[PDB]
Design a protein around this ligand. Structure first.
Ligand SMILES: [Zn+2]
Ligand SMILES: [Zn+2]
Ligand SMILES: [Zn+2]
Ligand SMILES: [Zn+2]
Lengths: 116, 98, 269, 49, 533, 539, 46, 67, 48, 98, 97
RNA sequence: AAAAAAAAAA
C-alpha cells in the first residue's frame, strides 16, 4: 500500500539536482556536499581517496536515513585548496585507479586464457 | 540545607569560592528555587492519582522467589492497597506491632 | 595525494567462477567493487509477462515470479540494449527488450515438465542458461533433467504466454543479480586485529592463510593497512564472471564520471 | 441564527410537573394511537408524530 | 510391528496381547510408572523403587499438538513455550491440500513452505512434514544499525525479491438472488445508469452480461464485483407520473476498499431455497514489508523494522548474507536457549545433510556432541562466524552467531491493521464516529485519555477531542425554563411552548451526547434546566 | 470517538530524534490540518490548492468564512479556487506538524505525548527507541494511535506542554522516564572502556552524526606513533555544556573507595565527568538510565529541555554507528562454562542434595527442634527452601565469577541493558526450586506430586528442585514442575489487571478536580481547602 | 448473449442465457464455474 | 508447492537440481552425497533442498477444472 | 465418521471427490460452515 | 517499599489529605465519593448514574459547573489547567503595527 | 450453527460457544481446534485455583498450551495419547462379579 | 444497517 517504487533509489525526479553544495559557516574552507540517489559505494570510495590527500583536514560521509537514498560529505581543507577541487581530485584519482585495474584485469584474463 | 552547606568554613576552607563565583551561585540558587515552585492551575489531584496507580501495575514482579521467614499473616500487594483505599472495617490480616 | 596502483593476480578461472587477489588498493575500493558486482552490474531478465492460457495449478503472479527469476545469457547483448526509460519507443523496440514465447499443452497421461527449453526467444543471442547443458552428450551423471523446472502439468492443462525481457541491475530487483555469492576476504591470519578471537585455537584456518599448524594468529602489526584482498566471484549463469568484473568496473567508472560531470556543471555558480 | 450565544452557568435539576409536560408538548390532545404508519403518510397523534 | 509395516500386527493386537493398558487419571494414584526402562535395571542397593507396575512409552507424549512442534522445549522457559503454542495457530502456510476448490472467507497460503531442518519426531504424526507452515531461514544474531531493537527483525530485501515468505491472501465474497412471492425482486445483471436509482460511484464496466465478473480480471479499490439490481416497490404516484425515472435500485456487492488483486475463481449454483447463488474468490499477493509479524518456534515474536538489500547487508567470508537479523537482547530475559541449540543443530544438519532430531528429553543429543560434529565441517565449534560490514567492508570486531533456523510468518500484516480517518460517517443515534476499520470509524478517546489530558492541564485539547471533532451541536434554550425551545431558522422565530416565551431565547453549543442525555432524562420525568443566565 | 486520528503498528527507528515520529504517506494524505490563509503564505497555499488531492503535498478542502466547504477531491470550478485572507484550507499533513502520540492502556502522564511529523516511505509509525520506556512499547506487533490537533491554539498547547523533551522527568518519582536502552546502552558500556582506541578515520566518520559539534577536532589521546582517540574522548563531545557528575559502575568493588586507588581506578569503575567532558569510568545503566542523579537527569536540570532532548538523540546516532565497527552478538558459546566450573557446580548441587537428604533424615529421626513462631512443617520447609536457594545463588555466583570478559551475556547483564544475575544462574548453573504460591509443589496425587515418585517423598526431585540448567535441559518431571511454576506468572498477570484498573479509575475519579489555585492553596471542585501549599512546600 | 460455464464433474462447455437455472444439461450437477476471461492483463515479473 | 528458481540468501540456481536430487536419493545415495554430487557446497543452498517439500505432486492428483 | 460418505475411502477416491486425504474430519458442515464441538469439563456424577 | 517502588511524598500526602478532609474516613468507593458535596454530573459520571441523577432531580440539586467532568459534559472550556483564567484584549496596548 | 446449546426461545439459560467455527489457517490450528477442552468456569473469576496446572494433568492434557488473557488455564488441549472413554454398559462386569 | 455470540492482538 505504502510501498515506494523500487526505481527511486537510483533515479532523480523532475528538477532534482544530483549535487547540492552547501558552504559551512562554523569554520573556514569547509563544504557540505549532498549527493542524491546514491549510497555507501561512492561515499566510501570518495572519502578513502580524499584521506590520501595531505591538503585535506576533515573528510567524512553520512547516510542520514536508510529510507532516503542520499548521502553527505563534510570536507574541510587548508587555506590554499578548495574542498570542491579536492572532490574533483578524489574522483579523478578513483577513475584513474579503476581504469588501471580494468586494463590489468583484462591482461590477466587474457594471459590466463591463453596460458591454458 | 543552605546554612549547613554554604557555611563560612566550607566556602572558604573547602570550596574556596571567589567573590563573583559566590554572587553567581547565590543568583543561580535564587533563580532555580523560583523555577521549582508549583505552577498555579496545575492539576495535582489527577497527577497524584496517576502517579499512585501506575506503580500498582508493577506490583507483581516480586511474586516468585518467596519462601517465608515469619509465620505472620500479612496481606501484601494490590489487595492490601484495596484494603487501604476502600477503608475496610474488617482487614484480612489485622496486626499490632507492640 | 594520488591514486593507488592496483595489481591483480588471478588464481582460478572457470565457466562460472573466478578467484583472484587484489594487491595495493584501499579497502573502500574493494568493498565498492563487491557492491557493484552484486547490485549495479546490469543484466537481462524477464520483466513483462502476459498470459493467455493459465489452466494449470499455480496462479498468474506465481508463474510470472518463477519466470522472472530465470537467468538469461546476456554477455553480448546487455551493453547495446538501452533501458525502457531511455528509448523513444513505446511498444517494446528490439533495441529495448527481448521477446520470449511459451506454448505448452499437455495431452499425455504422464506428467509434463515445462522447463526453460520450452521458452523460445526471438533473439538468437539471448537464451536461458540451459544452452550450456543440452550439449553434454557425455552424460555419465545419469540424469538428463538439467533444465530449470518452471512448472509441472497434468493432462488437460495448458500454458501460453508472451514475455519481454528488459535490462536492469540488482539494485532495482534481485532477479537482475548477475552473481551468486561474492566471497570477499582480507587479512586471513588476523595480523591487524580487526576482529578479536576469545580463543584463537578454536577457529579453523582460512584457505588463504600463511601460518603453519601450531600457530593460530599472526603477530600484531599496528603499521599494517589492508592492501591484499581475496575475491571469489561466482556467476548465476547470466554473465561470465570476467564479464561481471569488467562490467562492474565500467559501471563504477560511468557513475564517477557522471558525478564529475554534475559537479563541473554546478561549479559555474 | 440571530440568537445570543451564551455559556450555561448552572444546571438546575428538578421534576417535570404534569402541567409543564402538558404545556411543552407539541402533541395537542395527547398521543392517542399506537399505529406508527397510516396509509402513506405519518399519523398525527401516533408514534411517528 | 515391522511386519505390520508389512501386513497386519496392528496396535489393537498389541493391546489385546496384554502389554499396553489404558490407565486413566484416577488409576494413576494407585500405580507406579517408570520414566524409562533405564529405571528398571538399577541395582537394589541404590534403587529408588523395586516395585514398578507401568512404564512410560515416551515422556514427549505429554505435550499437545501445537506445543510438540517446538524444537527442544526442555531448554526453554515455560511461558515462551506457552507463547509459541498460542502463536502456532496464527502461523501461515498451506492449511489444506484442496484449497483450490474451497472458498473460505479468509485464507493465507505461503508460496514455498519448507519442512524444518531441526524436527521433532512428534511432527511425523501431525503431518507437519507434508503440510508445513514456515521457512528455514539463515539468521544472524547481531546488532546491525539498531533497527532490530525490541524484538524486531531485519529482512534481506534481495531474498524477499527472490521469494522469501511471499504469500497469497484469498478472500471470498458471496451473493444470492431472492424470488420470494411476497418480496421485492432482484436479479443478477449489469446495472445501468438510467434504470438504477442510487448507484454508487464505481467502475461497472468489468462485469459481464449477467452482472458477475470473470476470473483473471484485476480488481482494486472500490470496484464493483457482483451486479445486483432490485425492483423498486410499486409507489405509482398519480400526482406526477414523470417522477418515476427509475424502476430499479442498485444492491450490488462491492470490493473491500484498501485491497487489490486478481479474481481467482467464480462459481454459480443454487442454494437451499433454489435461487441463484454466486460465490467468488479473489487472491491478493502479500510481499513481506516493514511491520509484518514474524516469529520463531520459541516465542521470539517481532516485526520487520527495516529491509536491507544484499549490498548493504552484513556478510561472511563466503559471501553469505543472512536473511534475517535478530537482536541478541531478546535472548537473556527470555532464556530461549533452545533457539540457539536449534540454530546450532540446523547448521550441523545443513552441512552434514541430515534432518536433525530435536525430540525433548533425548540424552543422545547434546550441545557438546553437536559442537564436536560441527567442528569437523570446517566451522567454529560454537557456530560463530566472522562477518564483515556491508557499508564499509571492515571486519566486525565481535564474532557473531549465524545459522539456519525455522521462522513462521504470522497473519498479522500491517495492511490489515493500518487505519486513518479525517471525516466520514457518523452514528444515527449519537452522531459520533463509527466502529472499526470496515465501517471507517474513528479512534476511541477513552476515559484514561481524558484522565491524562487532565493531568497535562490542557483544557483546549480536551475541548477539541471531546467537543469540537466528535459531535458539536447548537440548541435553543428558553431563559426562564431552561429547556429546549422551538427554533424555526427559516423565518427566524423562537417559541417555548412551556413558557409562552418568544423573545428571551438563548443559543447553547454542546455535545450531541449531552443533548440525548438531557432528552432521555426528560423522558425520566427529570428537568435538567440549563440556566444560561 | 474522535474524527482526525490514525492507528497503526509501530517499528523502531534509531535515526529519528525523540521529538519526532515517522508517519506513513497514506496516513499523511488522509489526515489534514486546517491552515489559515495569511498574506505570509498565500503563494504556497495557492500552489497547494492547485496541486489538489491527487498529489502529495496538497489539500482536500477550502473552508471559507461562511462555513461553505469547497471540495478539491474533484477538480472544481477555477472560480472556486480563490484564497481570501481569513480562509481555512485543509492541507495535507506535512513535515514538522505537531501531533499527539498515544499507546493504550494509558497508565500515567507520559503515555501520550507530543511529536513532530516526519513523513517516511513505508507503512508503520516509526518512533525513537528511548520513547519505549514511557509508552511501555515492545515493537512486537504493538498498535499505537496518533491524533492531529485542528487549531493553532491546540498546536501551541502541544508545543508548549505535551512535547517529548518537556516530558523527560516524571513528577511521580523525580527521575527521568526515558533512558538509553538495548544495544545503544551495551555499546556505551563497550565504548567507554579503557582499552578502546579509535583511529582518525573512524572518528571522522563518527563526527558526521553529531549535529551539535562545533567543527573543531579534539587533539588525540595519543600523538605518536599513530594518532588515536579513545571512546571517552568522543563521548565527551556528545555531552554538552557544564555537566559534572560522580557515580560508580555496576561492578565497582566496595573496598576500592577506602583504598589508595580511589581516584585512579584499576578497573575504571569510578565514573566522573568534569566540565561536560568524560574523564573517568565506564558508563552503564547507573549513569545513563532512568535512575535519579544520572547523566540525563543532570543535563536536563542544568541545560533545559531542548538541549537534553537533543542529547538523547545525539548519543544514539554516534553509538549505533560505532557499533557497526564493534558489533555485539550472543551465541551458544556464551552459555557454556568452564569444565572445572561445571564440575564445581555439579559437586555443589550434589552436596546440597545430600544436605537436604540429611535434613529429611534428622526430621524423621525426631531430631529437628522447631523454631519459635512456627510449627515443625514450617521449620522443615524453611530449612529446605533456604538450602536450595543458597545452592542456586552460590552456583550462580560461581558461574558469573567464572565468565570471561569476552562473554556477551555477562556484557548485557553488567551493562544493565537486559537480564540479571538470576538469568545467568538459570541458564548456566541450575534453574532452581519451583514454587507454587511460595511453597512446595503440592501433592496433587495421594502423597505424590507425580506417579513416578514414591509416597511421602520430600526429597528435592519430587519436591520440584531443578538440578539442571537450561543449557543441559530439564528432566520430564522437573519440566512439568517448571510448567506449573511458569503458569503462576501468567495467572497472576491476568486476575489482577482488572482490579488494578478499577482502583486506578476510582483514584482518578476521587481526585479529578483537585488543583493548585492562584493563592498557592490546593482546593477541590467545591472550593474546600485541602492543603495550604502543595506537598506542604508548594513545589 | 448466451455465455458459457464449466460443469463441476462433466467439465463440459455448458452455454445458456442469464435467466436459465443453474443446471448441467448432460449430468445434472448444480455447481458450474465461470470461464477465464479473454482480456489480457499485464503482470510484472518482480 | 514447487522448488524455487534461486537460493534465497545466495542466488544460486537450484531449479534444475530437484529431479536430479530425487533420482540420486532413490538410486542409493544419502542426502549429503547427493548434495555434494549436485555441487551445492554451501549449506545456504543445501537448506533449500533438504527442507523443501513438493506439494505440487499432491496438487496434480486433483482433476482439472477444464477438460 | 462411520455414516458419512467419506468412510474408509482411499487417497485416490478422496482426491477424485476433491477432498483432502490429510483432512482429519471431526467436524460438521452446517449451512456450508465447518462447525466443531468443544469438549466440556464437568464434575463426575454419582461420586461422593 | 515492599516492592522497592518509590513514589514522591506530595502525591501520597495529597491523597491522605483528600480522605481526611471531611473529618471522618472518606473512602474511595461509591459510598465515599457519591456522599460528598460535589455536583450531580460529577457524581453520576463515576458510579450509580441513574440513582444520583434522580436523587438530584427529587432534591432539586443545583450543579454550579465547577468540576472538570461537568464542563466536559457541557463541552465548554473546563475551568482547570490552562483554562483556569480568561484572556482579555488590551485596548490601550495596541501600538504601532503594520 | 449458533452454538447456544438449548432451546431457541430459552437460549439465555444455555451455554454459549459449545459449537465453534473451525479454524482453517494452518493444519496445526485445525488439529488444535479439534482437540480442545473447555472448562465451564466463566472468564471473570478472581480465584486462581481452577486456572492452575494440576498434578493430575500428566500426559492427559497439554501443560504448555493455554490462551493468553482472561481465559488462561480454563481452555486447554489434549495430550498426544489422550484417549477419551467412549462408554460401555456395566452389565457383564456385574454378572462376572 | 442494528443487536448478540465466538475467535484472537497488545
Ligand atoms: Zn526501447
Ligand atoms: Zn421556557
Ligand atoms: Zn455435468
Ligand atoms: Zn545459496
Amino acid at each position: 500500500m505504502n510501498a515506494p517504487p523500487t526505481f527511486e533509489s537510483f533515479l532523480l525526479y523532475e528538477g532534482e539536482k544530483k549535487i547540492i553544495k552547501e558552504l559551512d559557516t562554523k569554520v573556514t574552507n569547509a563544504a557540505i556536499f549532498t549527493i542524491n540517489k546514491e549510497d555507501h559505494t561512492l561515499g566510501n570510495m570518495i572519502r578513502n581517496q580524499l584521506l590520501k590527500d595531505p591538503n585535506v583536514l576533515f573528510a567524512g560521509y553520512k547516510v542520514p536515513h536508510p529510507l532516503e537514498h542520499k548521502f553527505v560529505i563534510r570536507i574541510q581543507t587548508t587555506a590554499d585548496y578548495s574542498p570542491q577541487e579536492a572532490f574533483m581530485n578524489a574522483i579523478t584519482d578513483l577513475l584513474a585507479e579503476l581504469s588501471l585495474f580494468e586494463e590489468r584485469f583484462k591482461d590477466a584474463i587474457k594471459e590466463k586464457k591463453e596460458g591454458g | 540545607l543552605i546554612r549547613s552547606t554554604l557555611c563560612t568554613k566550607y566556602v572558604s576552607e573547602e570550596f574556596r569560592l571567589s567573590t563573583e563565583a559566590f554572587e553567581w551561585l547565590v543568583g543561580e540558587i535564587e533563580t532555580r528555587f523560583q523555577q521549582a515552585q508549583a505552577n498555579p492551575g496545575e492539576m495535582v489531584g489527577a497527577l497524584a492519582a496517576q502517579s499512585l496507580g501506575e506503580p500498582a501495575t508493577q506490583m507483581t514482579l516480586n511474586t516468585f522467589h518467596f519462601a517465608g521467614v515469619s509465620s505472620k499473616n500479612v496481606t501484601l500487594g494490590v489487595p492490601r492497597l484495596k484494603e487501604i483505599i476502600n477503608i475496610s472495617k474488617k482487614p484480612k490480616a489485622p496486626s499490632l506491632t507492640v | 595525494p594520488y591514486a593507488n596502483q592496483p595489481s591483480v593476480q588471478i588464481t582460478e578461472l572457470t565457466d562460472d567462477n573466478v578467484k583472484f587477489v587484489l594487491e595495493d588498493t584501499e579497502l573502500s575500493v574493494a568493498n565498492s567493487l563487491r557492491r557493484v558486482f552484486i547490485a549495479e552490474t546490469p543484466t537481462l531478465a524477464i520483466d513483462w509477462v502476459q498470459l493467455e492460457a493459465n489452466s494449470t495449478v499455480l496462479s498468474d503472479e506465481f508463474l510470472a515470479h518463477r519466470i522472472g527469476l530465470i537467468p538469461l545469457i546476456s554477455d553480448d547483448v546487455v551493453e547495446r540494449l538501452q533501458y525502457t526509460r531511455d528509448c523513444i519507443c513505446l511498444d517494446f523496440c528490439p533495441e529495448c527488450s527481448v521477446e520470449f514465447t511459451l506454448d505448452v499443452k499437455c495431452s499425455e497421461e504422464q506428467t509434463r515438465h515445462v522447463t526453460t527449453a520450452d521458452l523460445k526467444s526471438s533473439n538468437a543471442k539471448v537464451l536461458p542458461v540451459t544452452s550450456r547443458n543440452q550439449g553434454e552428450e557425455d552424460n555419465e551423471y545419469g540424469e538428463s533433467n538439467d533444465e530449470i523446472l518452471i512448472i509441472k502439468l497434468r493432462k488437460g492443462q495448458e500454458l501460453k504466454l508472451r514475455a519481454y525481457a528488459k535490462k536492469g541491475f540488482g539494485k532495482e530487483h534481485a532477479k537482475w543479480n548477475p552473481t551468486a555469492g561474492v566471497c570477499f576476504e582480507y587479512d586471513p591470519d588476523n595480523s591487524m586485529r580487526h576482529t578479536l578471537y576469545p580463543k584463537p585455537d578454536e577457529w579453523p584456518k582460512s584457505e588463504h592463510t600463511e601460518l603453519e599448524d601450531d600457530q593460530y594468529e599472526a603477530p600484531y602489526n599496528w603499521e599494517a593497512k589492508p592492501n591484499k584482498f581475496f575475491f571469489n566471484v561466482e556467476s548465476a549463469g547470466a554473465l561470465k564472471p570476467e564479464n561481471i568484473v569488467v562490467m562492474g568496473v565500467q559501471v563504477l567508472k560511468n557513475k564517477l564520471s557522471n558525478l564529475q560531470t554534475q559537479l563541473s556543471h554546478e561549479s559555474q555558480n | 441564527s440571530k440568537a445570543p450565544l451564551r455559556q450555561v452557568k448552572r444546571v438546575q435539576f428538578g421534576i417535570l410537573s404534569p402541567d409543564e409536560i402538558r404545556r411543552m408538548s407539541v402533541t395537542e390532545g395527547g398521543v392517542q394511537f399506537a399505529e406508527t404508519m397510516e396509509g402513506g403518510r405519518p399519523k398525527l397523534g401516533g408514534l411517528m408524530d | 510391528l515391522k511386519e505390520r509395516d508389512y501386513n497386519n500386527y496392528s496396535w489393537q493386537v498389541l493391546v489385546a496381547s496384554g502389554v499396553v493398558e489404558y490407565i486413566d487419571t484416577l488409576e494413576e494414584e494407585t500405580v507406579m510408572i517408570a520414566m524409562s526402562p533405564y529405571d528398571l535395571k538399577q541395582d537394589k542397593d541404590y534403587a529408588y523403587c523395586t516395585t514398578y507396575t507401568h512404564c512410560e512409552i515416551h515422556p514427549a507424549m505429554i505435550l499437545g499438538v501445537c506445543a510438540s512442534i517446538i524444537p527442544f522445549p526442555d531448554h526453554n522457559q515455560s511461558p515462551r513455550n506457552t507463547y509459541q503454542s498460542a502463536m502456532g495457530k496464527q502461523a501461515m502456510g498451506v492449511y489444506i491440500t484442496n484449497f483450490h476448490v474451497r472458498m473460505d472467507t479468509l485464507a493465507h497460503v505461503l508460496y514455498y513452505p519448507m519442512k524444518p531442518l531441526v524436527t521433532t519426531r512428534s511432527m511425523e504424526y501431525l503431518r507437519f512434514r507434508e503440510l508445513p507452515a514456515g521457512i528455514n531461514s539463515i539468521v544472524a544474531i547481531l546488532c546491525y544499525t539498531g533497527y532490530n531493537q525490541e524484538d524486531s527483525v531485519i529482512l534481506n530485501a534481495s531474498a524477499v525479491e527472490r521469494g522469501f515468505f511471499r504469500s497469497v491472501f484469498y478472500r471470498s465474497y458471496k451473493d444470492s438472488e431472492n424470488k420470494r412471492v411476497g418480496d421485492q425482486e432482484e436479479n443478477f445483471e449489469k446495472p445501468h445508469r438510467g434504470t438504477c436509482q442510487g448507484m454508487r460511484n464505481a467502475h461497472y464496466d468489468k462485469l459481464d452480461d449477467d452482472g458477475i465478473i470473470a476470473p483473471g480480471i484485476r480488481v482494486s479499490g472500490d470496484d464493483v464485483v457482483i451486479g445486483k439490481t432490485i425492483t423498486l416497490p410499486e409507489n405509482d404516484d398519480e400526482l406526477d407520473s414523470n417522477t418515476k425515472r427509475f424502476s430499479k435500485r442498485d444492491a450490488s456487492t462491492f470490493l473491500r476498499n484498501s485491497e487489490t488483486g486478481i479474481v481467482d475463481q467464480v462459481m454459480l449454483t443454487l442454494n437451499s431455497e433454489g435461487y441463484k447463488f454466486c460465490k467468488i474468490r479473489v487472491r491478493s499477493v502479500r510481499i513481506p514489508q516493514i511491520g509484518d509479524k514474524f516469529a520463531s518456534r520459541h516465542g521470539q515474536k517481532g516485526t520487520c523494522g527495516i529491509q536491507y538489500r544484499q549490498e548493504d547487508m552484513a556478510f561472511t567470508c563466503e559471501g553469505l548474507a543472512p536473511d534475517i537479523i535478530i537482536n541478541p537482547h531478546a535472548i537473556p530475559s527470555r532464556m530461549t536457549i533452545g533457539h540457539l541449540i536449534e540454530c546450532l543443530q540446523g547448521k550441523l544438519g545443513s552441512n552434514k545433510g541430515e534432518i536433525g532430531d530435536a525430540t525433548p528429553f533425548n540424552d543422545a543429543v547434546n550441545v557438546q556432541k553437536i559442537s564436536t560434529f560441527l567442528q569437523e565441517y570446517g566451522y567454529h565449534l560454537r557456530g560463530n562466524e566472522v562477518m564483515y560490514n556491508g557499508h564499509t567492508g571492515r571486519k566486525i570486531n565481535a564474532q557473531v552467531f549465524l545459522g539456519p533456523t525455522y521462522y513462521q510468518r504470522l497473519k498479522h500484516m500491517v495492511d490489515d491493521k493500518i487505519h486513518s480517518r479525517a471525516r466520514g460517517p457518523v452514528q444515527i443515534l449519537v452522531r459520533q464516529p463509527m466502529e472499526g476499520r470496515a465501517r471507517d470509524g474513528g479512534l476511541r478517546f477513552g476515559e484514561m485519555e481524558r484522565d491524562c489530558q487532565i493531568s497535562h492541564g490542557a483544557a483546549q485539547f480536551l475541548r477539541e477531542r471531546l467537543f469540537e471533532v466528535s459531535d458539536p451541536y447548537r440548541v435553543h434554550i428558553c431563559n426562564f425554563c431552561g429547556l429546549i425551545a422551538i427554533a424555526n431558522l427559516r423565518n427566524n422565530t423562537f417559541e417555548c411552548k412551556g413558557c409562552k416565551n418568544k423573545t428571551q431565547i438563548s443559543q447553547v453549543r454542546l455535545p450531541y451526547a449531552a443533548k440525548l442525555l438531557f432528552q432521555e432524562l426528560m423522558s425520566m420525568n427529570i428537568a435538567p434546566r440549563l440556566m444560561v443566565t | 470517538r474522535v474524527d482526525f486520528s490514525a492507528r497503526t503498528v509501530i517499528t523502531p527507528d534509531p535515526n529519528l530524534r525523540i521529538d519526532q515520529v515517522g508517519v506513513p504517506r497514506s496516513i499523511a494524505q488522509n489526515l489534514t490540518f486546517p491552515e489559515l490563509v495569511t498574506p505570509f503564505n498565500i503563494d504556497r497555499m495557492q500552489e497547494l490548492v492547485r496541486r489538489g488531492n491527487s498529489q502529495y503535498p496538497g489539500a482536500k478542502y477550502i473552508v471559507r468564512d461562511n462555513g461553505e466547504r469547497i471540495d478539491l477531491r474533484f477538480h472544481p470550478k477555477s472560480s472556486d479556487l480563490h484564497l481570501q485572507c481569513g480562509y481555512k484550507v485543509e492541507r495535507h499533513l506535512r513535515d514538522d506538524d505537531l501531533v499527539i502520540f498515544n499507546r493504550q492502556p494509558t497508565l500515567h502522564k507520559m503515555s501520550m505525548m507530543g511529536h513532530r511529523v516526519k513523513v517516511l516511505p513505508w507503512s508503520t509509525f516509526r518512533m525513537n527507541l528511548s520513547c519505549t520506556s514511557p509508552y511501555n512499547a515492545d515493537f512486537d506487533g504493538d498498535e499505537m494511535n496518533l491524533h492531529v490537533p485542528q487549531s493553532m491554539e491546540t498546536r501551541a498547547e502541544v508545543e508548549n506542554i505535551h512535547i517529548t523533551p518537556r516530558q523527560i522527568i516524571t513528577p511521580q518519582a523525580n527521575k527521568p522516564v526515558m533512558g538509553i536502552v538495548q544495544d545503544t546502552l551495551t555499546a556505551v558500556r563497550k565504548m567507554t572502556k579503557r582499552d578502546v582506541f579509535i583511529t582518525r578515520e573512524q572518528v571522522m566518520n563518527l563526527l558526521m552524526f553529531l549535529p551539535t559539534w562545533d567543527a573543531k577536532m579534539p587533539q588525540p589521546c595519543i600523538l605518536k606513533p599513530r594518532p588515536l582517540w579513545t571512546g571517552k574522548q568522543i563521548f565527551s563531545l556528545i555531552i554538552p555544556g557544564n555537566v559534572n557528575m560522580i557515580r560508580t559502575h555496576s561492578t565497582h568493588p566496595d573496598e576500592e573507595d577506602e583504598g589508595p586507588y580511589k581516584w585512579i581506578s584499576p578497573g575504571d569503575t569510578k565514573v566522573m565527568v568534569e566540565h561536560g567532558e568524560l574523564i573517568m569510568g565506564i558508563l552503564c545503566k547507573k549513569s545513563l538510565g532512568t535512575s535519579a542523579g544520572s547523566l540525563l537527569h543532570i543535563c536536563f536540570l542544568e541545560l533545559g529541555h531542548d538541549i537534553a532532548g537533543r542529547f538523547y538523540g545525539n548519543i544514539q546516532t554516534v553509538i549505533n554507528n560505532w557499533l557497526l565497527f564493534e558489533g555485539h552478538s550472543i551465541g551458544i558459546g556464551d552459555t557454556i562454562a568452564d569444565p572445572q566450573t561445571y564440575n564445581e557446580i555439579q559437586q555443589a548441587i550434589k552436596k546440597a542434595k545430600d544436605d537436604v537428604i540429611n535434613v529429611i533424615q534428622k526430621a524423621h529421626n525426631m531430631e529437628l527442634e522447631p523454631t519459635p513462631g512456627n510449627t515443625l512443617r514450617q521449620t522443615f520447609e524453611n530449612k529446605v527452601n533456604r538450602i536450595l536457594n543458597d545452592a542456586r545463588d552460590k552456583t550462580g555466583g560461581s558461574a558469573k565469577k567464572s565468565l570471561t570478559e569476552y562473554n556477551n551475556l555477562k556484557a548485557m547483564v553488567v551493562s544493565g541493558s537486559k537480564g540479571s544475575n538470576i538469568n545467568i544462574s538459570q541458564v548456566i548453573a541450575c534453574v532452581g526450586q519451583q514454587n507454587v504460591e511460595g511453597k512446595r509443589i503440592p501433592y496433587g496425587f495421594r502423597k505424590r506430586t507425580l506417579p513416578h515418585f514414591i509416597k511421602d517423598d520430600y526429597g528435592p526431585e519430587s519436591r520440584g528442585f531443578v538440578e539442571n540448567s537450561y543449557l543441559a535441559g530439564l528432566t520430564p518431571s522437573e519440566f512439568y514442575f517448571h510448567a506449573m511454576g511458569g503458569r503462576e506468572g501468567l495467572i497472576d498477570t491476568a486476575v489482577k489487571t482488572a482490579e488494578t484498573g478499577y482502583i486506578q479509575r476510582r483514584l482518578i475519579k476521587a481526585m479529578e478536580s483537585v488543583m493548585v489555585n492562584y493563592d498557592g492553596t490546593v482546593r477541590n471542585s467545591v472550593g474546600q481547602l485541602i492543603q495550604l501549599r502543595y506537598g506542604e512546600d508548594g513545589l | 448473449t448466451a455465455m458459457t460455464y464449466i460443469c463441476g464433474e462433466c467439465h463440459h462447455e455448458n452455454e445458456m442465457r442469464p435467466r436459465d437455472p443453474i443446471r448441467c444439461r448432460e449430468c445434472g450437477y448444480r455447481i458450474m464455474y465461470k470461464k477465464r476471461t479473454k482480456r489480457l492483463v499485464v503482470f510484472d515479473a518482480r | 508447492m514447487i522448488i524455487p528458481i534461486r537460493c534465497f540468501t545466495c542466488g544460486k540456481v537450484i531449479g534444475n537440481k530437484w529431479e536430479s536430487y530425487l533420482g540420486l536419493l532413490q538410486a542409493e545415495y544419502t542426502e549429503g552425497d547427493a548434495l555434494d554430487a549436485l555441487g551445492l557446497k554451501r549449506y545456504c543452498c543445501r537448506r533449500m533442498l533438504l527442507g523443501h517439500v513438493d506439494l505440487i505432486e499432491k496438487l496434480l492428483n486433483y482433476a482439472p477444472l477444464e477438460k | 465418521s462411520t455414516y458419512c460418505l467419506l468412510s474408509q475411502l482411499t487417497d485416490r477416491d478422496l482426491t477424485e471427490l476433491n477432498e483432502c486425504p490429510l483432512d482429519p474430519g471431526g467436524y460438521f458442515i452446517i449451512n456450508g460452515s465447518e462447525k466443531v464441538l468443544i469438549a466440556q469439563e464437568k464434575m463426575a456424577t454419582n461420586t461422593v | 517499599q515492599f516492592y522497592g517502588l518509590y513514589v514522591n511524598y506530595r502525591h501520597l500526602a495529597l491523597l491522605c489529605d483528600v480522605m481526611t478532609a471531611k473529618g471522618h474516613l472518606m473512602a474511595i468507593t461509591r459510598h465515599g465519593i457519591n456522599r460528598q458535596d460535589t455536583g450531580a454530573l460529577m457524581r453520576c459520571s463515576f458510579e450509580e448514574t441513574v440513582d444520583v441523577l434522580m436523587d438530584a432531580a427529587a432534591h432539586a440539586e443545583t450543579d454550579p459547573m465547577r468540576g472538570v467532568s461537568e464542563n466536559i459534559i457541557m463541552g465548554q472550556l473546563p475551568k482547570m489547567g490552562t483554562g483556569c483564567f480568561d484572556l482579555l484584549l488590551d485596548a490601550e496596548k495596541c501600538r504601532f503595527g503594520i | 450453527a449458533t452454538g447456544n446449546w438449548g432451546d431457541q426461545k430459552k437460549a439465555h439459560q444455555a451455554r454459549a460457544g459449545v459449537s465453534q467455527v473451525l479454524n482453517r489457517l494452518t493444519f496445526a490450528s485445525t488439529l488444535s481446534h479439534l482437540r480442545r477442552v473447555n472448562s465451564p468456569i466463566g472468564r471473570d473469576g478472581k480465584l486462581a485455583k481452577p486456572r492452575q496446572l494440576h498434578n493430575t494433568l500428566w500426559g492427559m492434557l497439554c501443560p504448555a498450551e493455554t490462551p493468553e488473557g482472561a481465559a488462561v488455564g480454563l481452555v486447554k488441549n489434549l495430550a498426544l495419547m489422550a484417549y477419551i472413554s467412549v462408554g460401555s454398559q456395566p452389565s457383564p462386569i456385574l454378572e462376572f462379579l
